[PDB]
Amino acid sequence: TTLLNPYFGEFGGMYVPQILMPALNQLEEAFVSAQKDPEFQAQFADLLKNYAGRPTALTKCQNITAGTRTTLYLKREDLLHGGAHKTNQVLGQALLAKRMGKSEIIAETGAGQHGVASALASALLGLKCRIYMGAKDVERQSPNVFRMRLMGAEVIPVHSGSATLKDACNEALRDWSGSYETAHYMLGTAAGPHPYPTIVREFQRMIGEETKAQILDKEGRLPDAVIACVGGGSNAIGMFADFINDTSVGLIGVEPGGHGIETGEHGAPLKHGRVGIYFGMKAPMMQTADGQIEESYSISAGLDFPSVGPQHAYLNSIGRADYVSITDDEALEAFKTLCRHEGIIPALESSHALAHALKMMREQPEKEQLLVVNLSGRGDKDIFTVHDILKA
Amino acid sequence: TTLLNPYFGEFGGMYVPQILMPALNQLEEAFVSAQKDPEFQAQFADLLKNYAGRPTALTKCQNITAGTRTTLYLKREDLLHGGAHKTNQVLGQALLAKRMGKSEIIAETGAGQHGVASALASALLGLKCRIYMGAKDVERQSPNVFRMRLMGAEVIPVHSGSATLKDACNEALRDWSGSYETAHYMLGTAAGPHPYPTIVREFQRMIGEETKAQILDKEGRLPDAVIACVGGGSNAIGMFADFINDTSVGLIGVEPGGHGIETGEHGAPLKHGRVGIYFGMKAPMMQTADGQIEESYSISAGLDFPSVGPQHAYLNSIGRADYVSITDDEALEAFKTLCRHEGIIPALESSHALAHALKMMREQPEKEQLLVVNLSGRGDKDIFTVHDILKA
Amino acid sequence: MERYENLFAQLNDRREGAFVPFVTLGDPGIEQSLKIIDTLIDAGADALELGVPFSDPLADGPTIQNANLRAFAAGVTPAQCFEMLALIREKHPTIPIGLLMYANLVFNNGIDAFYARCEQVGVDSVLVADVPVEESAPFRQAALRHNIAPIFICPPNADDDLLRQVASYGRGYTYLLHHLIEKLKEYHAAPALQGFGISSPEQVSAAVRAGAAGAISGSAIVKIIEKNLASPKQMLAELRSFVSAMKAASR
Amino acid sequence: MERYENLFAQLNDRREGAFVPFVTLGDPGIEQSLKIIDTLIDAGADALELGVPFSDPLADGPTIQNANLRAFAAGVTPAQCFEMLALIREKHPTIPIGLLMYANLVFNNGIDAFYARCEQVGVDSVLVADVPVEESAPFRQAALRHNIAPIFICPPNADDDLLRQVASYGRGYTYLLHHLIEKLKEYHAAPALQGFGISSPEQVSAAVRAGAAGAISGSAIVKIIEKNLASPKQMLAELRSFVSAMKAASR
Ligand SMILES: *Cc1c(COP(=O)(O)O)cnc(C)c1O
Ligand SMILES: *Cc1c(COP(=O)(O)O)cnc(C)c1O
Ligand code: NA
Ligand code: NA
């Protein structure tokens, strides 16, 4: 049995080997307890404010919308300590681990951002952090790898399978099934087995709560739509959450279209995948007609999760949220546009969300609309990538 | 004649070719006017808050001081948009340029940070920005160079002289003496000819004002000392300013000691240079016994200004502020220490300030003291530098 | 069919435990795999536990992961595995055949269809590695409708409530990883098979003495395979030695 | 001494303007430089404006910057420049010699000491490129105490107040970059010398017709030098042609 519903419609659940159930149950319970603990909330709020730099700003982008009836605002998670939204939830999970009396943290990362976040959180809260990362990802993310080590985290390469994020995710679970007594698995997205999808949303919902209050203060009304990129689904759900009950507010999730949907080279399983059971959950997957799990492709390394959060799949099925895709080129253009007209270098991940907002504006220049794009992170890391492409 | 005193004791002045005086006078006047203009202040505050992310946090670092009677706080300018404090003043200078009816910006940069800041400000406020940078610095700062261009700024290499920051500073003045009617020279530090030293301090003083209120809120009293690195003197004076009248508050500026003072390979002209007249001001300089201007050396590229702000030289002469130096190795160690114990990657520039605070703590473990280090910027840019060194 | 029921009854009348080896279908190749399995059986295996190569076996250790890699290298697919399962059953009518699967492969084209296919080829049981008892309803139900025994793992960190569920939900045999054994018998759970670490004769006899109905060698067999890759013949020889040694210890 | 006063008086009695060329001391080398200067004088230069190589000539254009680079390449130092200044004066007793300096080089070892050294070698004037009239007090005072004429630049964007200061503060000649000229004479300013762009004979005659007492070729001379680096002899020849041409236009 459980305390909270493990399912969002037909999606979600706890599909892990029996040996891991006790870990999930203990975790859910500590979470339920911490959510009612004022002391826990105060400590979490303190770190978010005095360490991470919350609340983050909500920037109005006038140059970008000039000549149209579109008003665009960007939730500045790129200004959060670490350069991305991931810092919010890792801070909460670490306090959770401490509440459970755990002294060790286990994490998985592909692009490296989650690894860096887990490492900085562990260093700050005195936790021994060991991070699993796919061999192919290590080679490609030398910078983030040195950052993790620089912060005292142990980086462990994963050569098994395709040696990417999914393969790293498996090695973490393996380690955890045998050490959850002293170690806490700090999953990096609103996915995986319950209670992770629920826990990550709650530890990222301040994004949406701040956005509502901020837009209410500057515009005196809720936005017509909030837009966020969807890799695993953490920044998107974090933005959506507080708006779910606001029916007039459109929720738009953006999956990477890669080289194009019809090319098969993309990372949009929610709208172009097929439901399966993997990584401890029932959700749409990038898989062969056979049932083998495939990789998620995108110019942005961070949208490599070959699946998507359960709640997004659910929100989509009931029509509460809409999911679309943006290609590498569309993201690149949005990336160049923001640099030139607002002086902000967006992460190529976040650039997918911006690109969609730009399309909503451009296709219907005379449509009046108040939009908010969740700028999940900064793009200083993508400088060379955008360079070689424009150079080649 | 002038509106404000161009001198701080014997230091400062306006040593520029006659042809440029009108530009300085016009600038001073527009500044005096803008400082009394509530509308200007509101617009500046709005950008600092909703665009740059102010106020920045003040982080207490408990892990670093464990086992000692030292309490350390870090003013998080590393969390400011752009990753460094430089963003504060470039925003004000750009509004100043607009107030004067100018549509163009001229800037000089060595490490590239000021170039990036000028570029982002110009892009945001619709200004045509052209940046001068030393050829040697271009080669070494490929990333920041692409960032500036990415933000629409024109990057112009300077091969004359030693092809570094000082040589770039000369080319800018040359350009400005002939185009100040439509262009504004956005100097990057609390130095140069009046009114720049005064203007940059005022546009960076929110650092100290926020720090006072924040420490007052968390500790109920002013710090025993505020510590900042000193390259040109902008982040340091920005932190000091609001504390100058608080006699009980020690002000400590930290110059780069490079490989060591006695080696002659450093960048500490304030305490180890000789007063001269260069870059439009009377201030201590890095120069030969002959009077030729030399370069400033430091592991951190950003502390390459071969001189120092006039007000610092003055504050030092009257004993109000104390200036010391920190070597490459001391800065490196402080850099490694912060990463491991607080999960914050500091800029190698800021690391000099931290290193000094660490020394104040370590040498006298039982001395009770409330310290504040101005973490002027993030060190993501220094990752490889600290890598190759620890690797070699 | 009642292959497990018949096997255990026969083993009880001979006061001996069952020895069950595990191997990945198609490792290192279809043909060599079919030869391995026939060798395991001729050496004295009482039943088999066969695994189907899956892309992300998040519930397996290094040894098995490499087995999947080797299998995929030979282009082994679930469809081929089922072709093998059929060939194996045709040659051996009474040996219990259990499959070790991962949820997605079972759910992929319909849970019910999967179990219908198992029944058609002659499979006796299925253990879905990543489906805890709390999520098994759809699986065990489908398994029962097609006369397939839904196998469940009884972990060490198990509690009384789990023992009760495993006891009423499982069939064929309980995959065990003194008190646990007695309790499982108290709840009329399927005969327990000691797993994990089973790689030497003395472990088999120890399992039987503790009250288990047998032992399962989770990866020892796979290990012998990867070490004799360069010599297919020596591989079959060593497999035959290890298995007869292990089986002998159950008597 | 009153070299400028005597020169202008002599030029007025001959109804002609003065032609003043500028060159960097030590460019491209000490010896070649001394030969250049003697050639400039033999070609008809009325006075000289000599620059001392400075590390950061933030008030000079490309041409001159390269001249400093060439000079530094030959190891030219301020001390050597002063050795040259002495040699030049010893050979030429009446030609006015003005120096174009940068503040630090003058302030380096004491402003007063610098002007004392100028007087000793026979220098007639000093124009500190980066010292506006507002900051000149210490400089012009030191210059006067050592019989050195403090020269000031009268820019185009100058206003009446500036004209009045330049007029009472300057000596020898006003470095000008119709109304300005008349006003300078109204305030009894030192004779004005048209500078900037002066590179052709017709510019010299135009300056004299406008009411200026002469012209200063700010960089034309330097240009001829850098283009004939490979041929020291052809360099002196062209310099001699240009200078006699320019001088002739002032008559
Ligand atoms: C990691 C990352 C993402 C993808 O993760 P979600 O869980 O989908 O939010 C998106 N944006 C940025 C900047 C990231 O670093
Ligand atoms: C540019 C820089 C400095 C040096 O400039 P000051 O004018 O001395 O403040 C210091 N810290 C950081 C992070 C910088 O980027
Ligand atoms: Na995804
Ligand atoms: Na300096």
Short mmCIF file of C-alpha atoms in Angstrom, two decimals, chain A residues 5-15 192 194 197 270 274-278 280-285 307-319, chain C residues 107 111 135 138-139:
data_model
loop_
_atom_site.label_atom_id
_atom_site.label_comp_id
_atom_site.label_asym_id
_atom_site.label_seq_id
_atom_site.Cartn_x
_atom_site.Cartn_y
_atom_site.Cartn_z
CA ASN A 5 -1.65 7.83 -5.40
CA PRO A 6 1.28 6.42 -7.42
CA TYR A 7 -0.67 6.94 -10.65
CA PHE A 8 -1.73 9.89 -12.78
CA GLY A 9 -4.48 8.23 -14.77
CA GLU A 10 -2.92 5.09 -16.28
CA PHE A 11 0.63 6.50 -16.14
CA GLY A 12 3.25 6.07 -13.42
CA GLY A 13 3.34 3.36 -10.79
CA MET A 14 6.27 1.69 -9.03
CA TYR A 15 7.79 -0.86 -11.39
CA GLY A 192 10.86 7.20 -12.44
CA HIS A 194 6.61 6.83 -7.33
CA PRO A 197 7.45 12.22 -9.98
CA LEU A 270 5.12 11.88 -25.28
CA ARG A 274 4.71 4.45 -27.45
CA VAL A 275 3.68 3.61 -23.90
CA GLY A 276 5.92 1.10 -22.19
CA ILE A 277 7.22 0.18 -18.76
CA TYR A 278 10.76 1.31 -17.98
CA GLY A 280 10.20 2.04 -12.78
CA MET A 281 7.19 3.65 -14.47
CA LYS A 282 4.48 3.27 -17.12
CA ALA A 283 4.97 6.14 -19.57
CA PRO A 284 5.47 6.88 -23.28
CA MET A 285 8.92 5.68 -24.40
CA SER A 307 10.81 9.03 -21.85
CA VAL A 308 8.72 11.62 -19.98
CA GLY A 309 7.12 12.23 -16.61
CA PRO A 310 3.87 10.32 -15.85
CA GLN A 311 1.90 13.43 -14.93
CA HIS A 312 2.66 15.10 -18.28
CA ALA A 313 1.37 12.02 -20.13
CA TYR A 314 -1.76 12.26 -17.99
CA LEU A 315 -2.19 16.03 -18.35
CA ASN A 316 -1.94 15.48 -22.07
CA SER A 317 -4.50 12.66 -22.19
CA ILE A 318 -7.18 14.73 -20.46
CA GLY A 319 -6.43 17.76 -22.62
CA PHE C 107 3.71 -5.32 -21.96
CA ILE C 111 0.44 -8.54 -21.56
CA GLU C 135 1.88 -4.09 -9.50
CA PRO C 138 -2.44 -7.71 -14.64
CA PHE C 139 0.54 -10.06 -14.99
#
